[PDB]
Amino acid sequence: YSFKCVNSLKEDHNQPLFGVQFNWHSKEGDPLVFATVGSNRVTLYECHSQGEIRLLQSYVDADADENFYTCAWTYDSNTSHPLLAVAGSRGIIRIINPITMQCIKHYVGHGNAINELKFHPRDPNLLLSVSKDHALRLWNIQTDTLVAIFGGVEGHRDEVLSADYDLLGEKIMSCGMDHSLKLWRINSKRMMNAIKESYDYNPNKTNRPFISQKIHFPDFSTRDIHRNYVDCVRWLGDLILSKSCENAIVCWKPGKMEDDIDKIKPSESNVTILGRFDYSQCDIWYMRFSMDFWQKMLALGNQVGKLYVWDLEVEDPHKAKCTTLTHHKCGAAIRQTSFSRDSSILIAVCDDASIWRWDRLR
Amino acid sequence: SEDEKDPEWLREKTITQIEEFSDVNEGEKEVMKLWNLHVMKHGFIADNQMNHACMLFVENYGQKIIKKNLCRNFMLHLVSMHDFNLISIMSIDKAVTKLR
Amino acid sequence: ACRKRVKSEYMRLRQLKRFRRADEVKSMFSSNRQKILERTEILNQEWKQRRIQPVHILTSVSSLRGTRECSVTSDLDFPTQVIPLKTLNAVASVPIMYSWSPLQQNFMVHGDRECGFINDEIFVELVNALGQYSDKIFEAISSMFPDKGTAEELKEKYKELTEQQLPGALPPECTPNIDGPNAKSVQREQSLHSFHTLFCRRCFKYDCFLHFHATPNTYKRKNTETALDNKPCGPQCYQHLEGAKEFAAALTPPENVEWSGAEASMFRVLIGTYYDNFCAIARLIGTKTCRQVYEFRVKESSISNHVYNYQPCDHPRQPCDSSCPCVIAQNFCEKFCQCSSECQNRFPGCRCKAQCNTKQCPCYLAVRECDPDLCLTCGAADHWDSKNVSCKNCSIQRGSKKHLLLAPSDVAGWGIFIKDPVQKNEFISEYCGEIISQDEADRRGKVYDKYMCSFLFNLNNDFVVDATRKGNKIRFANHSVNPNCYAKVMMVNGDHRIGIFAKRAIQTGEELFFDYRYSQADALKYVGIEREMEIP
Ligand SMILES: Nc1ncnc2c1ncn2[C@@H]1O[C@H](CSCC[C@H](N)C(=O)O)[C@@H](O)[C@H]1O
């Protein structure tokens, strides 16, 4: 409803850019931050008044020359320090502590490569890693252990990139390249225990390692929803927000309207449709966007640099309040966007190693 | 080693494979699920092994069947394998007497 | 007058239902958002609880003064900054492997026209007869526009409505379980039919994973299983007139007490097992004493090898003629096949007595192992739990899986080793996977060729085995034209397997190798590497 661009940047490595996320692990008044990950580079930025931006810490990786495109905010509940968990095309997870200015932690074992990193909304120590292996890998970062594994056999028939966390972290989602919609509860009795003993381990306690768990049955599945490449799925309470490469963002909830999300069965596949948000020229993958912390407004970038904005108030896609923000200079692509913890600051990524920062006119 | 007679996920695979039958009652379903799950748990293939399987199904988890009280389906299950020429008359009474 | 007009608006009523789609969307659009507002602040409330450290900028490092620095400019007028790039710690270059599940077995493998109506046949004569210038005209009236089913099409659609009212919630032919308090008097053929359909003899269980194939379970043994006739085998049982002894064959002091219908449900099941046991029938279920159980029963009575896939080849009455499938498949007429021991294609078995895997043994000489009932002479059925038997053609039957060690192979990614030393021709676990048909093998083969993967093997002339999505450890073993081990196809009671055995004497620490035996395009594109040094 109110978002104009007053700032932009561009770096020198020229690689197509990757995900950016704003430091929602902050305080109302602390310096709010947003980072940026390159193919082998990682960096951060600071937002200042009058549109000013100062480049923060920057790191490179020359030994492992593979793309790094997955990141997740990290925070230490004990020492009250935020961090950032990053991974790329080799499946090794690196954790950066700006205060420590060093990356010292071992996380290897991933199959091919990681295509998503996210943390639990409450627990700042548990990281979600998604694989092109059609399986879901989990790591307890503080304990450096391997949390239960999802989608070993009964996962998506094609590559999986996208997932989501509810604010309780009650369940976890899987939406593969095959347009299927697979969901796993985290509130499982077996799951919750394995979380507890994940913190309960000692190398000298036993010769046995932390016995992980294989879980494969997804609580829901549907395929007729998307006829084209799906690359973005979200949660709106009991609703399943989703975006494909078909120039149509769509949201739905499984089965009938009265059906509660927490009582669904794996065998069920009924879906009743209630949403539609079409767009244009964004019919390609590698396209991710941002959602505000309060989950109220969205910023849909486009490969020509166009920004599609729609509100999620009582104003619904039935009326689809439109706002097609656009800047002329950028036309390469928009891999990712980043709403701030507040709604004031917006950051848009332009593919030619360039950034465009928009500010809300609150 | 991870060398066991049956991986854990396969147990629920057949559980899903059995339970999908909309035309089969739960009492017969639960017993055969219990009956499936022990067979690969011990890997018995010969006729005497199947005879030894039944005497091991009872007195080890047939009390659970007694706890589940799913006897009448099991008795028809017991005569089924009897009529399937895998079990003799003497074996079927052992399960009958174990409950009583 | 208004009769027709009220009729005229009757078939136009469907368009009113069009806008009912958005009746409850806004209502739920408020409920979900309201709950979202509750949840978002709670996390923010918790976010309010934990203090969070601010950020710190870099600085010149005495030991890293000349660290390479990148420069970021502004697409806008903002200044350009240059900051060094501190490289992260070394990371172990680990070979790539694809997700799977541990498998220890082998398992067989928007239109513009719509429809709809209203079942108001009571009032269609009000529509027509009381609405002309009758009831059956609804099919025709609904049929002029292609937006609904035709007059006949609606008739089958109405047949669904009667098939929608229906009796109580139950499948049309299934019956409640006897354990249930609502146990019915389902007779032996109907009750066992569910067991009949679900059971599978090949793996002697119900609904074999590894196996529409079905046979009538009528068995060619003697027709009856009679036990006792006119004799007091029970503590108190009838004898009566002994002329009924032949009468029981011909069919093929009275007293009594009450009965129950539910107990009678298994009473004539019991007469299906013995047909004359006056006592075991009383022993299992009966409201009468073993004397009177006769009284209830009498009134109740008065009331050149291999190539193809194995098959239980059939010829019920006729002997093993040309109609016997094994004649075509060119293999044995095994016990599951409908040939008897008379049928010359009967398999004798594992005829050895001392060792039943030796050079001169039909188990070892042929492609078939010794079933526990085949080399009984050498203890093929001796304590299957125990691993010590003179019959070594039972390792897969007893599941004596080897300890395979996953390891990373310089030849190709990962690899498989063995924990214990193994001499020449000792067992290694089977290539556990899934058995697919030839056509899907063509489909999956091009899929696997599209992804450049190797977990597919032709089972036989009739089938192909796949172990890609689910497989065992050995599928991760590499290949060598000079392998230390080998793969040999095994038969088990008419089931295709493949034994893995070591070519030479081997100690712990040697990588496993074999040959895929693939197509020419498959071989060079995958295993065109053999790790040899060229000097010149
Ligand atoms: N002997 C060999 N040398 C080089 N590559 C091989 C190979 N055998 C299989 N491969 C490749 O490896 C892939 C399957 S993985 C099998 C290789 C090895 N055992 C491992 O576990 O990693 C196939 O796509 C094939 O191209």
Side-chain angles (χ1 to χ4, degrees), chain A residues 1-361, chain B, chain C:
Chain A
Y1 191 66
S2 302
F3 269 102
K4 299 289 94 176
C5 180
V6 294
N7 184 279
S8 189
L9 295 170
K10 184 197 191 326
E11 58 271 12
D12 54 348
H13 69 280
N14 205 10
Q15 180 73 25
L17 269 176
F18 305 107
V20 290
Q21 178 54 41
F22 212 95
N23 186 32
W24 306 356
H25 292 171
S26 50
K27 308 296 278 189
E28 214 53 47
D30 277 341
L32 264 67
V33 185
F34 64 93
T36 309
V37 294
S39 54
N40 76 326
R41 286 185 171 175
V42 297
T43 185
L44 297 93
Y45 293 99
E46 197 58 38
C47 189
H48 311 254
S49 60
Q50 299 90 27
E52 211 275 334
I53 300 294
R54 283 201 312 103
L55 167 62
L56 302 194
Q57 319 289 91
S58 309
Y59 318 112
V60 73
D61 189 358
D63 285 13
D65 285 339
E66 71 269 1
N67 179 9
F68 303 147
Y69 50 101
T70 71
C71 45
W73 278 133
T74 315
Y75 167 76
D76 190 2
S77 51
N78 309 333
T79 64
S80 169
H81 294 89
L83 294 90
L84 183 63
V86 70
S89 309
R90 275 202 52 240
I92 297 186
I93 301 100
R94 308 311 309 155
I95 192 66
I96 185 64
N97 195 323
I99 312 298
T100 308
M101 61 79 71
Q102 289 171 0
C103 171
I104 53 170
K105 245 171 176 191
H106 182 74
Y107 297 99
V108 189
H110 194 78
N112 313 335
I114 295 171
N115 48 28
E116 176 182 351
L117 293 178
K118 195 182 177 174
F119 268 74
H120 188 264
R122 269 95 174 282
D123 199 324
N125 304 317
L126 272 295
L127 165 65
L128 174 70
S129 52
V130 182
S131 71
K132 50 178 56 62
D133 282 303
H134 314 174
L136 188 153
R137 180 69 74 87
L138 282 186
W139 316 71
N140 193 343
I141 310 305
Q142 188 274 331
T143 80
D144 302 77
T145 56
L146 200 70
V147 176
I149 315 303
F150 292 165
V153 61
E154 208 171 355
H156 296 267
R157 277 79 59 197
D158 210 19
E159 169 172 1
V160 184
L161 283 72
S162 187
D164 195 5
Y165 263 100
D166 62 87
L167 309 186
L168 277 296
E170 181 186 4
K171 302 181 284 294
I172 208 67
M173 187 66 204
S174 308
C175 185
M177 187 66 203
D178 55 350
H179 315 167
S180 310
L181 277 296
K182 292 190 180 59
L183 166 78
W184 280 267
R185 281 103 166 95
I186 300 170
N187 57 274
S188 173
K189 271 67 200 170
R190 156 198 196 177
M191 186 66 204
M192 64 183 73
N193 305 328
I195 298 161
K196 312 309 165 288
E197 292 95 11
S198 70
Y199 314 105
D200 175 28
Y201 189 84
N202 180 289
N204 316 83
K205 248 177 181 178
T206 47
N207 308 334
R208 287 267 76 179
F210 178 73
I211 295 94
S212 186
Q213 302 296 330
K214 288 191 177 71
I215 296 94
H216 310 286
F217 300 83
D219 316 309
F220 190 70
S221 189
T222 176
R223 56 97 175 172
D224 203 43
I225 316 302
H226 280 317
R227 286 87 171 80
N228 204 2
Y229 325 122
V230 62
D231 54 326
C232 283
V233 287
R234 287 81 58 196
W235 291 353
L236 199 72
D238 305 348
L239 268 289
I240 316 300
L241 280 155
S242 64
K243 160 196 167 298
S244 174
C245 304
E246 60 191 6
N247 270 343
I249 286 172
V250 61
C251 183
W252 58 274
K253 67 182 291 294
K256 326 153 194 172
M257 295 298 102
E258 57 175 359
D259 308 354
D260 172 69
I261 199 81
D262 306 318
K263 64 183 189 186
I264 62 170
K265 66 188 179 67
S267 57
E268 194 48 59
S269 61
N270 277 264
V271 168
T272 302
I273 197 64
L274 55 91
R276 176 96 283 154
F277 264 120
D278 290 23
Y279 47 97
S280 304
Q281 193 273 330
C282 201
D283 284 314
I284 65 169
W285 56 289
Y286 283 160
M287 295 298 102
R288 316 301 324 285
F289 47 97
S290 50
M291 187 66 204
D292 62 310
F293 169 77
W294 290 98
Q295 279 75 73
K296 302 176 173 169
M297 73 291 291
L298 71 83
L300 183 63
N302 210 349
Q303 195 268 336
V304 286
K306 282 219 162 196
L307 186 67
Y308 305 110
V309 179
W310 298 299
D311 71 88
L312 294 174
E313 323 308 314
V314 58
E315 157 60 37
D316 48 354
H318 291 85
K319 291 312 291 179
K321 189 174 186 175
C322 66
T323 296
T324 60
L325 297 176
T326 305
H327 194 86
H328 60 290
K329 289 300 184 51
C330 175
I334 296 189
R335 300 303 209 200
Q336 188 69 270
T337 49
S338 173
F339 288 99
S340 52
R341 171 158 201 76
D342 49 346
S343 299
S344 63
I345 308 302
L346 196 147
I347 295 90
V349 176
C350 185
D351 197 76
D352 51 342
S354 56
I355 304 96
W356 295 82
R357 191 183 69 87
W358 292 53
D359 290 352
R360 175 198 179 199
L361 282 72
Chain B
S1 175
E2 288 95 355
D3 297 317
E4 83 297 329
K5 294 181 176 67
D6 173 40
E8 81 305 350
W9 56 277
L10 272 179
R11 277 161 263 266
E12 302 85 19
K13 295 312 174 296
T14 178
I15 276 163
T16 47
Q17 180 168 339
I18 295 154
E19 76 201 3
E20 64 85 22
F21 283 99
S22 57
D23 309 329
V24 180
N25 303 274
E26 78 300 331
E28 43 191 2
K29 256 176 185 183
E30 204 274 345
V31 174
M32 187 66 204
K33 293 205 181 61
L34 291 188
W35 191 273
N36 276 347
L37 294 175
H38 70 277
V39 165
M40 73 291 291
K41 185 197 307 178
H42 311 145
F44 294 162
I45 59 174
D47 209 353
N48 48 12
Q49 296 196 77
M50 294 182 286
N51 288 258
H52 286 297
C54 303
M55 61 79 71
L56 202 66
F57 181 88
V58 309
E59 64 85 23
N60 271 112
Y61 314 82
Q63 184 43 246
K64 282 79 176 175
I65 282 298
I66 297 176
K67 292 155 191 178
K68 268 80 172 177
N69 302 273
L70 286 187
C71 309
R72 306 166 89 191
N73 303 152
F74 186 41
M75 311 295 218
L76 276 296
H77 181 74
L78 287 159
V79 65
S80 309
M81 63 185 74
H82 186 273
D83 297 329
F84 292 164
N85 71 76
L86 312 182
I87 298 298
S88 51
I89 304 173
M90 61 79 71
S91 301
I92 76 176
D93 172 67
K94 290 176 183 177
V96 169
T97 51
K98 181 259 296 177
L99 171 62
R100 315 166 184 179
Chain C
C2 308
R3 290 165 48 191
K4 296 159 279 298
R5 308 151 203 162
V6 167
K7 150 194 191 174
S8 306
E9 61 86 20
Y10 277 159
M11 71 305 297
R12 303 156 199 167
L13 290 176
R14 311 304 177 79
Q15 319 205 12
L16 193 146
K17 324 178 186 179
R18 298 178 181 173
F19 50 78
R20 302 176 191 171
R21 296 153 48 185
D23 287 0
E24 300 296 327
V25 291
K26 283 289 200 183
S27 59
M28 61 79 71
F29 280 142
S30 56
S31 65
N32 54 9
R33 268 313 299 255
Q34 166 53 245
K35 269 68 184 174
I36 289 155
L37 305 181
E38 311 149 10
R39 312 283 82 72
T40 56
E41 182 45 60
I42 290 172
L43 269 291
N44 208 62
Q45 275 298 334
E46 306 148 354
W47 156 90
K48 294 181 176 67
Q49 309 321 301
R50 305 168 291 279
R51 184 257 165 198
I52 279 155
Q53 168 82 12
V55 72
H56 170 53
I57 206 60
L58 263 168
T59 182
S60 184
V61 182
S62 167
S63 45
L64 274 81
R65 307 190 183 111
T67 294
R68 284 175 286 189
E69 318 178 354
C70 81
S71 186
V72 56
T73 194
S74 181
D75 307 326
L76 295 205
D77 55 330
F78 301 92
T80 298
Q81 323 175 39
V82 188
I83 290 173
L85 281 298
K86 261 68 187 182
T87 314
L88 309 190
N89 71 294
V91 285
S93 166
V94 291
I96 297 296
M97 183 278 288
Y98 197 94
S99 69
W100 59 296
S101 76
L103 199 67
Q104 298 179 118
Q105 54 84 18
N106 303 276
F107 151 75
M108 61 79 71
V109 176
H110 320 92
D112 307 337
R113 308 167 192 80
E114 295 87 356
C115 282
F117 64 91
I118 302 166
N119 186 41
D120 54 309
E121 303 164 353
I122 296 91
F123 299 89
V124 183
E125 64 89 16
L126 283 74
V127 178
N128 283 284
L130 286 175
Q132 276 320 112
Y133 63 91
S134 75
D135 291 325
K136 307 158 304 308
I137 310 181
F138 190 92
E139 305 150 338
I141 301 299
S142 288
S143 74
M144 283 74 74
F145 206 79
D147 60 347
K148 295 162 71 177
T150 65
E152 298 309 305
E153 272 189 335
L154 300 148
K155 282 159 189 178
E156 292 86 6
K157 287 159 196 298
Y158 186 41
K159 291 154 207 161
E160 312 158 13
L161 282 190
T162 310
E163 295 300 325
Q164 270 296 327
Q165 305 168 357
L166 285 185
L170 187 78
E173 315 309 315
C174 170
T175 58
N177 59 326
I178 303 173
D179 276 321
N182 210 21
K184 303 204 305 187
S185 185
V186 192
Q187 55 95 16
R188 215 189 183 200
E189 300 174 354
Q190 286 149 7
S191 54
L192 275 291
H193 174 269
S194 56
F195 292 165
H196 155 60
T197 45
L198 267 294
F199 185 73
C200 53
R201 295 177 67 186
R202 290 273 276 124
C203 191
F204 49 84
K205 69 178 185 291
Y206 283 67
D207 185 24
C208 292
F209 63 104
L210 79 169
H211 304 130
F212 285 94
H213 164 60
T215 79
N217 286 320
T218 53
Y219 300 128
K220 296 190 168 193
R221 84 294 181 265
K222 186 54 168 79
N223 311 76
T224 185
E225 310 87 28
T226 50
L228 63 89
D229 274 333
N230 286 320
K231 49 179 65 66
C233 296
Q236 303 301 308
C237 172
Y238 279 169
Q239 319 89 19
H240 265 293
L241 304 189
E242 296 296 316
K245 277 180 151 66
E246 310 89 3
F247 292 165
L251 284 175
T252 56
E255 64 159 49
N256 63 7
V257 296
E258 58 88 20
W259 270 96
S260 45
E263 268 164 298
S265 175
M266 291 55 68
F267 195 84
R268 77 289 186 275
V269 176
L270 294 174
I271 211 69
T273 67
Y274 323 107
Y275 162 83
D276 64 345
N277 197 311
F278 295 165
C279 303
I281 292 176
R283 189 266 300 168
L284 274 164
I285 280 172
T287 79
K288 282 177 173 185
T289 185
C290 188
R291 296 283 293 273
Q292 309 167 330
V293 171
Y294 181 76
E295 276 298 329
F296 188 66
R297 188 60 249 172
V298 60
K299 65 178 72 66
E300 273 212 340
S301 304
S302 76
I303 277 166
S304 65
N305 305 270
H306 185 61
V307 187
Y308 289 85
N309 174 42
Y310 173 71
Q311 76 279 15
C313 64
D314 180 24
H315 49 87
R317 193 275 306 159
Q318 197 174 3
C320 320
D321 66 321
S322 65
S323 83
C324 183
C326 299
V327 167
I328 297 96
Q330 191 58 255
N331 275 276
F332 269 89
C333 293
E334 291 288 352
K335 281 73 176 175
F336 292 164
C337 312
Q338 278 81 327
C339 280
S340 171
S341 52
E342 179 273 334
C343 186
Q344 294 71 17
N345 212 8
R346 167 66 71 229
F347 186 54
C350 196
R351 301 305 95 221
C352 294
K353 189 155 302 184
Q355 199 197 2
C356 311
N357 74 305
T358 185
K359 159 66 202 166
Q360 297 79 9
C361 188
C363 275
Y364 181 77
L365 279 165
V367 69
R368 280 87 61 188
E369 272 204 350
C370 312
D371 173 83
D373 291 331
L374 293 192
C375 194
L376 285 153
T377 48
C378 68
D382 177 78
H383 304 290
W384 311 263
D385 298 331
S386 311
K387 315 302 169 190
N388 48 3
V389 285
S390 60
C391 169
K392 295 315 186 192
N393 271 109
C394 74
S395 64
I396 44 179
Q397 308 170 354
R398 301 194 176 195
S400 75
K401 37 197 169 303
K402 269 291 185 176
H403 199 146
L404 291 195
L405 278 69
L406 173 62
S409 59
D410 49 346
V411 175
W414 300 20
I416 296 302
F417 285 67
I418 185 67
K419 176 170 164 298
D420 60 357
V422 161
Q423 304 300 101
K424 59 173 187 66
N425 304 323
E426 272 78 6
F427 176 70
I428 297 89
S429 312
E430 192 261 335
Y431 204 114
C432 307
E434 301 96 311
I435 297 89
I436 68 185
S437 63
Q438 295 292 328
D439 59 328
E440 187 54 44
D442 311 332
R443 263 85 55 78
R444 253 168 164 164
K446 66 177 73 68
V447 165
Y448 297 155
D449 288 328
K450 150 184 47 187
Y451 293 99
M452 283 73 74
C453 183
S454 67
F455 290 123
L456 201 43
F457 288 93
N458 163 256
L459 183 63
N460 66 329
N461 186 91
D462 298 349
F463 289 99
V464 166
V465 60
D466 176 32
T468 316
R469 75 281 197 195
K470 309 184 277 306
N472 67 327
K473 311 175 182 181
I474 191 167
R475 81 197 199 101
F476 316 119
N478 294 68
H479 152 89
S480 166
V481 191
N482 63 7
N484 60 5
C485 301
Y486 64 91
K488 213 50 66 193
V489 163
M490 295 298 102
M491 295 298 102
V492 174
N493 292 318
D495 301 330
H496 293 245
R497 323 287 322 283
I498 174 156
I500 319 299
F501 294 98
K503 278 174 57 184
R504 67 210 68 158
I506 293 158
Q507 76 275 15
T508 286
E510 297 199 12
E511 196 175 328
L512 294 174
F513 309 103
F514 70 104
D515 201 318
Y516 293 100
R517 300 287 87 204
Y518 285 176
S519 165
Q520 211 278 345
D522 308 339
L524 280 181
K525 195 185 184 192
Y526 295 161
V527 298
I529 297 89
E530 296 305 319
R531 194 177 165 267
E532 203 67 29
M533 186 66 204
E534 59 97 8
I535 292 73

